[PDB]
Design a protein around this ligand. Structure first.
Ligand code: FII
Ligand code: ZN
Lengths: 11, 407, 323
């Protein structure tokens, strides 16, 4: 599954 | 009184905290209004259902979610294949906050796994065979410290770790996140965190770092990723925490920093936003609210006589209400806001933020505020490292027994 | 060649041209923790990536494999590093690579690795000609994309492309006057061009900001900007500001206006103004209105401010204990 556009990113 | 609502978010006056768009609609106000409407439904659910509100932290459910995740994850986590030590840290810390023991079978397996993530040249990568990077290095060190066994501590190759930090250090005081990588305030914090815990800080390692971090504070009072950028809670926490470790908090205009972070708490939602005019999010329960304990400690060291003796400079009750009512997934795990799905990252930070909000501590003075049932109380967390204060003390004591690499 | 999403996509272990290489399984150890149950496609590409990385095979096939590894997890910084090794080693056309990164950023714009990769390409090519327009397109989809604004500041500063930015800022403030990223950019442009010391500039900025405040009195960004550009010189340095804010109290009040008044009073008291006491009481009255009615979420902060102002500005503050 690809990273959700609705999620946070810290790195 | 009988008509008196003990929950701040449910009081009648609270409806006055809704957004006033001055009849000028823009993407920002439209988005903010959508969130407020969804949050209002949550607040009003008890009233519309004719039930008395009971704020319960679903510990059993969170534990099951965490316990399993520490062992195996679905492909929903493929996107975090380069952040496995973070998954270890997020899960172990959540368990620590919930006061769940870490079995030695588990502790030893985490140690071995983190050893495999450790680079021959120092630092930890996102997984076995991946190049070392400061973010997973920070997470790996924190995870090993939460375990706190001689085995856990022994995993860290201190000489190589220090060499690694030096290879990333820039002339302007900043650090790269990894070889050939980007530079932003996260690196200063990741480097200071691991270097202080393991006692590898040489006289010049952080030369110019405090000054570089200070240049990141902008006109808003907060701290941006790099000089010139918008103030953000993630970067502000990194900046302040790194400065606290370096004992250079004074390089910042602490007054405008305090005014900025306090303004980040949403009047209606109760939780914190990451930057001005953006949306509330449960992970900022830590990145933003965690600044208050840091500011309190800094201002107090300056002999500030106006500092409260029982509360942080934010609405502790409203933050707890936001987290408990809006950020828990029924199946276990925590989240950003209603409408979003759970993930270990938000589980770690919503809980960290809840703990901060429940516990005030300024030396001998101690005062808790536990909203909802008393079982909701979590273990305290250190505002600089975001691991148990006992784990911090234990780790530093142990590493101070060793000599700074090279002497 | 063969896209990761192509209906005819084939796993690497089933590709003839890869038959000579033995895939390298991930070394998770005897009893894994945080073990991800990868999909077939993911594990397959990564097992082959591990093989080429380990051998340090700098080939065209390895180059193409990184594109797939990136598509599967664009956050894998190790893959991005190896890809840059291959770009140099294989002497790959960097403009073609620019086309590639622009497509990748379009699909995953909140990623750290993609923007850093684009930055490296621009540095290598020493060409910023496509930057402002590219970034503007990303900002057209998310006007607050942090990485995008950060890359934009870097391009503008490194290549001295200041000429049309204030104009760009004005356009976005028109679209959404509440966009804090744009107010930050406004400050960025002015600080690095004319500066705020130039009285004609500062004046213009304040006129503009007060005008925006009148139009949307509850937009916190305008308020933060007004305070941000005046606070360093000292709010008390501008005697007309106070009078003018008090004039907005009727039809343009907000906890923001009230808070600013406290900031003005605070600085006045700091720079020993006339009627020390009259000012202090006005300030405490406002701190209380804020903590108890107008801005309760910040009650702990307002109580502290009231306490600080009291601690150092009361008529008794400089009076010895014996008196
Ligand atoms: C120790 C570390 C790694 C700290 C970093 C913590 C955070 C939260 C960093 C955020 C970085 C950032 C600003 C990313 C941009 O994308 N994120 C958003 O837009 C989220 P929001 O809308 O809340 O600003
Ligand atoms: Zn979040």
């Amino acid at each position: 599954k690809k990273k959700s556009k609705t999620k946070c990113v810290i790195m | 009184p009988v008509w008196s609502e003990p929950l701040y978010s449910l009081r009648p006056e609270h409806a006055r905290e809704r957004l006033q768009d001055d009849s000028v609609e823009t993407v920002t106000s439209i988005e903010q209004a959508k969130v407020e409407e969804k949050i209002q439904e949550v607040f009003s659910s008890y009233k519309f259902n004719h039930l008395v509100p009971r704020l319960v932290l679903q510990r059993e459910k969170h534990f099951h979610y965490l316990k399993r995740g520490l062992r195996q994850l679905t492909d929903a986590y493929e996107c975090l294949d380069a952040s496995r030590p973070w998954l270890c840290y997020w899960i172990l810390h959540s368990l620590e906050l919930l006061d769940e023991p870490i079995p030695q079978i588990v502790a030893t397996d985490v140690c071995q796994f983190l050893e495999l993530c450790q680079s021959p040249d120092g630092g930890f990568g996102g997984g076995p065979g991946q190049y070392p990077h400061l973010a997973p290095t920070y997470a790996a060190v924190n995870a090993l410290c939460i375990i706190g066994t001689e085995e856990a501590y022994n995993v860290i190759n201190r000489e190589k770790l220090l060499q690694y930090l030096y290879s990333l250090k820039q002339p302007d005081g900043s650090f790269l996140m990894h070889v050939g990588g980007e530079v932003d305030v996260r690196s200063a914090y990741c480097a200071a965190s691991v270097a202080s815990l393991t006692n590898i800080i040489t006289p010049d390692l952080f030369e110019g770092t405090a000054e570089w971090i200070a240049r990141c504070q902008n006109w808003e009072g907060g701290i941006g990723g790099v000089p010139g950028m918008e103030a953000h809670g993630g970067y502000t926490f990194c900046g302040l925490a790194a400065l606290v470790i370096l004992k250079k908090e004074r390089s910042l205009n602490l007054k405008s920093l305090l005014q900025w972070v306090t303004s980040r708490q949403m009047r209606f939602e109760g939780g914190f936003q990451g930057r001005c005019n953006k949306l509330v999010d449960g992970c900022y329960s830590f990145w933003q609210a965690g600044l208050l304990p840091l500011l309190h400690r800094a201002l107090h060291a300056q002999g500030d006589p106006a500092l409260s003796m029982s509360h942080w400079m934010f609405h502790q009750q409203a933050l707890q209400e936001y987290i408990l009512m809006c950020c828990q997934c029924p199946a276990g795990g925590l989240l950003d806001k209603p409408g979003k799905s759970r993930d270990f990252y938000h589980t770690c930070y919503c809980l960290s933020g809840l703990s901060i909000a429940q516990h005030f501590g300024s030396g001998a003075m101690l005062h808790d505020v536990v909203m909802g049932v008393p079982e909701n109380v979590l273990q305290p967390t250190h505002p600089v490292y975001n691991i148990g204060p006992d784990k911090v003390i234990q780790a530093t004591t142990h590493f101070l027994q060793k000599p700074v690499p090279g002497f | 060649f063969l896209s990761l999403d192509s209906p005819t996509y084939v796993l690497y272990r089933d590709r003839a041209e890869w038959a000579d290489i033995d895939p390298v399984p991930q070394n998770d150890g005897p009893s894994p923790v945080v073990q991800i149950i990868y999909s077939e496609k993911f594990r397959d590409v990564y097992d082959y990536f591990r093989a080429v990385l380990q051998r340090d095979e700098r080939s065209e096939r390895a180059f193409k494999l990184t594109r797939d590894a990136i598509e599967l997890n664009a956050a894998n910084y190790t893959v991005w590093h190896f890809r840059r090794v291959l770009l140099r080693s294989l002497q790959k056309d960097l403009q073609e690579e620019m086309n590639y990164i622009i497509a990748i950023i379009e699909e995953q714009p909140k990623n750290y690795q993609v923007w850093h990769h684009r930055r490296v390409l621009v540095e290598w090519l020493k060409d910023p000609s496509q930057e402002l327009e590219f970034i503007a397109d990303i900002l057209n989809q998310d006007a607050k994309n942090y990485h995008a604004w950060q890359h934009r500041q870097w391009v503008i500063q490194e290549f001295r492309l200041w000429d049309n930015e204030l104009q760009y800022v004005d356009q976005l403030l028109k679209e959404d006057v509440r966009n804090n990223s744009v107010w930050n950019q406004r400050h960025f442009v002015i600080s690095n061009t004319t500066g705020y010391s130039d009285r004609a500039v500062l004046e213009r900025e304040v006129q503009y900001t007060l005008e925006m405040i009148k139009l949307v009195p509850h937009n916190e960004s305008a308020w933060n900007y007004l305070k941000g550009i005046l606070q360093d010189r000292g709010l008390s340095r501008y005697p007309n500001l106070l009078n003018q804010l008090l004039d907005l109290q009727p039809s343009h009040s907000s906890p923001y206006l009230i808070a600013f008044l406290v900031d003005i009073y605070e600085d006045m008291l700091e720079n020993q103004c006339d009627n020390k006491e009259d000012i202090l009481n006005k300030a405490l009255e406002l701190c209380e209105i804020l903590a108890k009615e107008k801005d309760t979420i910040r009650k702990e902060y307002w109580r502290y401010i009231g306490r600080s102002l009291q601690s150092k500005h009361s008529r008794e503050s400089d009076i010895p204990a014996s008196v």
